[PDB]
Amino acid sequence: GSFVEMVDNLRGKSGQGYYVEMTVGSPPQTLNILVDTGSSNFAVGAAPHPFLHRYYQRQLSSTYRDLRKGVYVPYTQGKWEGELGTDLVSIPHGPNVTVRANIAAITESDKFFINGSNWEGILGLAYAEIARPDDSLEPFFDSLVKQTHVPNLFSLQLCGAGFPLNQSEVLASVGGSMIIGGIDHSLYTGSLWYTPIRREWYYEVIIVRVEINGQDLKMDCKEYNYDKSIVDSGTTNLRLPKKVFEAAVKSIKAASSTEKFPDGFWLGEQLVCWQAGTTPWNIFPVISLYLMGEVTNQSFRITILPQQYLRPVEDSQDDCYKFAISQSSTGTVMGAVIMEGFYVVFDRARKRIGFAVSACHVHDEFRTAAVEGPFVTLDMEDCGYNI
Numbered sequence: 344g345s346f347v348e349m350v351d352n353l354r355g356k357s358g359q360g361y362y363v364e365m366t367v368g369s370p371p372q373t374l375n376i377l378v379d380t381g382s383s384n385f386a387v388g389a390a391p392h393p394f395l396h397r398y399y400q401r402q403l404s405s406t407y408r409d410l411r412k413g414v415y416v417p418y419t420q421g422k423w424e425g426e427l428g429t430d431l432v433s434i435p436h437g438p439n440v441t442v443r444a445n446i447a448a449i450t451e452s453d454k455f456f457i458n459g460s461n462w463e464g465i466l467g468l469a470y471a472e473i474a475r476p477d478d479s480l481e482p483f484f485d486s487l488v489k490q491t492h493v494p495n496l497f498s499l500q501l502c503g504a505g506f507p508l509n510q511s512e513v514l515a516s517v518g519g520s521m522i523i524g525g526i527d528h529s530l531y532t533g534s535l536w537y538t539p540i541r542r543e544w545y546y547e548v549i550i551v552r553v554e555i556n557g558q559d560l561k562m563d564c565k566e567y568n569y570d571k572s573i574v575d576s577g578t579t580n581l582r583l584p585k586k587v588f589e590a591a592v593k594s595i596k597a598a599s600s601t602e603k604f605p606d607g608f609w610l611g612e613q614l615v616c617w618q619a620g621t622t623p624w625n626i627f628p629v630i631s632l633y634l635m636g637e638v639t640n641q642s643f644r645i646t647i648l649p650q651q652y653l654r655p656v657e658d659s660q661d662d663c664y665k666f667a668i669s670q671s672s673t674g675t676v677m678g679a680v681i682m683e684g685f686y687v688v689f690d691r692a693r694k695r696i697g698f699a700v701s702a703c704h705v706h707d708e709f710r711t712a713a714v715e716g717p718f719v720t721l722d723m724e725d726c727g728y729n730i
């Protein structure tokens with residue numbers, strides 16, 4: 344129902360990440376931790392780094408336990424390396440519990456920390472199957488559920504401001520909510536619609552249809568989930584498989600063809616600027632992603648606006664944006680810019696993910712983001728990719 348203690352416990356933005364305050368060790372060491380549904384390790388800065396003004400100091404914690412095991416985590420953009428151990432962990436604006444959890448003390452990294460992000464570690468909220476070095480390293484959420492009476496569910500409301508936030512504003516602003524163990528009804532409007540979690544590794548889902556202003560992209564639905572489709576708060580953009588990206592960008596260009604944008608804009612590399620307040624939202628299409636429903640042959644859709652997929656960036660008094668839709672070779676990624684339109688319920692207990700219109704989504708007087716259903720959709724299991 345209502346979880347006032349956890350409402351408004353996030354800060355940050357799509358491009359630098361959304362983080363929650365946590366404490367580690369005895370006496371407690373306060374750290375800001377990025378909320379990542381696209382990984383499964385609780386990994387924190389444990390050595391000086393130019394982008395960190397604080398880090399976890401294992402030698403100062405009386406409850407620290409050394410697992411005498413290293414961990415090496417390469418990813419696309421970079422890597423993080425560290426030392427495994429356990430310690431007592433709490434979330435000050437969370438449930439009133441303290442858990443004994445695994446912690447990867449980061450001793451080396453490349454393109455991991457973000458300059459000016461105000462976070463010092465990440466909270467891998469996905470399943471043990473993708474935890475590093477392997478699935479025996481119990482993720483934080485699994486420890487939390489196992490050691491307390493917290494229900495096996497969390498929900499995220501990521502609030503994009505709709506305009507740039509400077510260094511001081513982003514520190515003073517409310518970035519959203521992470522509700523641990525429940526659903527807070529003040530964070531959304533309309534109904535919650537649930538899609539099944541296909542498999543418990545990433546929060547994997549199945550997209551069954553895509554529309555650009557009601558026009559069906561008309562691709563074989565397997566293409567939408569090649570090689571997977573995931574909900575990931577640790578990725579900025581809506582990332583699409585190569586072929587889907589090329590078809591979607593062609594359709595988005597055609598719908599907005601009253602204005603021509605350079606190639607670098609469509610490549611998500613270059614900003615586009617309009618005189619203050621004149622952004623022509625109306626020329627850009629809405630994008631609808633239909634997701635497999637909980638009922639056989641039934642789907643629902645989530646609709647996003649250009650206010651979600653045009654990411655506000657400071658240039659001048661102009662209103663500037665980056666195109667926050669990009670190509671992927673590792674399947675669809677519903678990143679923070681998509682999550683900003685919705686209140687997202689990671690219902691681990693019922694192996695499903697819920698979507699509802701966010702009470703904090705950015706819109707205009709003419710259009711709103713939407714979560715609607717049901718729609719008759721056949722052979723949805725065929726939309727899932729295999730091998």
Ligand SMILES: CN1C(=N)N[C@](CCC2CCCCC2)(C[C@H]2CCC[C@@H](Nc3ccc4ccccc4n3)C2)C1=O
Nearest residue numbers: 379381382416418419420454455456457473575577578
């Ligand atoms: C997609 N994504 C994600 N959701 N989590 C990770 C790890 C994925 C797991 C998946 C299971 C297997 C192991 C790896 C880590 C990022 C967390 C968010 C901050 C980002 N930091 C970055 C990213 C890019 C950067 C580029 C330039 C400079 C800094 C940067 N900092 C790094 C990732 O790559």
